[PDB]
């Protein structure tokens with residue numbers, strides 16, 4: 001928060017009634033399991049719990065007051081009563097954002113939101129020479145609760161901000177972009193694999209363009225079939241386009257190449273100038289993500305060497321498609337952190353991109369249909385599937401003849417010890433499968 005707020009100065013702005021003593025808070029929490037001194041607790045209802053049941057707990061941990069939508073009789077701390085706590089949270093987020101005066105960029109899309117966010121954050125942090133001065137959305141806190149929680153983290157040390165906006169329903173981004181009011185808005189794409197109908201998806205992403213600053217820059221994907229609709233909706237605003245295919249885009253990539261790890265490198269071209277960029281990430285889609293981040297960074301005033309350095313400094317998250325090369329010349333992709341069926345299919349797509357022998361190495365997801373569909377999707381796409389775990393017995397069957405189930409990791413590892421250079425191996429499983437032990441044994 002840019003400054004502590006006083007409950008009695010919010011009755012008007014939140015349409016609230018103060019019950020009990022006045023209080024001043026310098027941060028907010030929506031969770032009794034993660035709150036401490038000086039903080040406002042916000043009581044939300046969900047499918048599993050009701051926040052209003054935890055007032056004793058938050059008072060004991062030092063919360064100064066609770067924002068509630070029903071009065072709790074004889075509460076152990078002051079209450080600020082409103083009709084809808086989701087909307088009061090939204091308003092608090094908007095109010096904090098209006099105190100912040102630095103550059104703010106936002107991005108939406110079907111896929112690549114988080115990655116463009118980390119890329120852009122890396123660029124701005126690299127240019128500033130300090131990580132703490134750039135606020136970015138933590139994890140995936142991007143929905144109608146996540147966004148105002150992120151905006152509430154805006155604080156006196158921040159100089160710029162990078163805000164992820166999720167669009168899984170119509171009107172969600174219309175609401176969150178109005179709280180956020182970015183200077184630059186990015187749409188990565190609409191309608192990518194494994195992610196309301198196509199026209200709804202296009203309309204939902206485009207909502208970002210409505211909250212954009214009046215001469216704010218729109219960053220748009222010239223390859224996307226919805227480009228012309230997004231361009232119209234962007235109305236007057238300055239526009240920067242990116243593309244892997246078109247010479248007239250503002251940001252372009254030439255001469256795409258993988259390094260020995262499999263990570264993508266390219267020549268950046270366009271209006272920021274030309275340079276070679278070596279990412280630490282896999283997949284052609286991450287080149288498009290880099291161009292979108294570069295475009296935004298350029299709109300914000302970052303020079304070329306800041307863009308390049310920021311893109312090259314970004315590392316993958318541990319166990320999230322980390323490509324490495326063993327001393328034996330084996331390519332091992334560590335994706336052992338976690339897995340769900342959708343993430344499995346995204347993994348398989350990455351692996352099928354490689355041209356020599358490909359070995360998919362799987363542990364169980366933490367049921368039968370899903371394993372079944374994962375193995376089937378892999379079939380005809382990678383050279384082999386090695387797996388461990390009883391649910392993974394269903395994947396191997398659906399995969400076919402070069403698929404092998406193993407009794408424990410120990411025999412899986414002995415099999416992989418036999419693979420030669422030019423082979424790519426991808427290792428993935430739920431956290432409970434502990435497939436990082438296989439990674440460690442090879443690397």
Ligand SMILES: Nc1ncnc2c1ncn2[C@@H]1O[C@H](COP(=O)(O)OP(=O)(O)NP(=O)(O)O)[C@@H](O)[C@H]1O
Nearest residue numbers: 110111112113114115116140188192285288289346
């Ligand atoms: N530009 C892109 N085009 C197509 N696929 C992509 C792109 N960027 C990322 N992906 C795929 O989507 C996965 C998730 O990347 P991420 O950057 O976390 O997307 P996201 O938009 O934040 N997803 P979510 O917040 O879960 O809606 C990656 O591991 C890739 O498989």
Ligand SMILES: [Mg+2]
Nearest residue numbers: 113114139140
């Ligand atoms: Mg994400």
Ligand SMILES: [Mg+2]
Nearest residue numbers: 113114139140
């Ligand atoms: Mg995300």
